[PDB]
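Reminder to self: keep the SMILES exactly as supplied, no canonicalising. Ligand is chloride ion.
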Amino acid sequence: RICLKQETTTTCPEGEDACYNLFWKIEMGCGCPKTEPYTNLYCCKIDSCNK
Amino acid sequence: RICLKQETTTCPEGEDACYNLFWKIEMGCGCPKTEPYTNLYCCKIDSCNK
Ligand SMILES: [Cl-]
Ligand SMILES: [Cl-]
Ligand SMILES: [Cl-]
Ligand SMILES: [Cl-]
Ligand SMILES: [Cl-]
Ligand SMILES: [Zn+2]
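C-alpha cells returned for the bound complex:
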C-alpha cells in the first residue's frame, strides 16, 4: 500500500493496509488511527486514496 | 448527536461520531474500530455521514 502523506507519497509497512485523512489539524498517512481524536476521519484501502 | 442510518437516529449518550462504511453500505452512530471496511468515514457533526 502507498498513501499520501502530510504530518508526499509513502509506502506503508507490511500489514498496514489502509490510508487515512484526519481533520480536527490536517494529517495524511498510513493506517487508520483508532485512538486519535478527530473531527472528520477518512480511511481507505486503495493506493493514494486519502486526499 | 444525530446520524443518518442504513443497515434517522439519535445516538446514545456519549457516542459523539457518525459513520459511513463501505466494503456493503452501512450508516449509523459511532465509528467502528474493529469492523472490516474498504472506505470508512467518521465525522462528528449531526447528520454528517452521507
Ligand atoms: Cl491497517
Ligand atoms: Cl496501523
Ligand atoms: Cl488499523
Ligand atoms: Cl446533538
Ligand atoms: Cl449537535
Ligand atoms: Zn446536535
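Points to follow up:
Chain B touches chain A at residues 31, 33, 37-44, 48 (CB under 8 Å).
Residues B 46 surround chloride ion (ligand 5) (CB under 6 Å).
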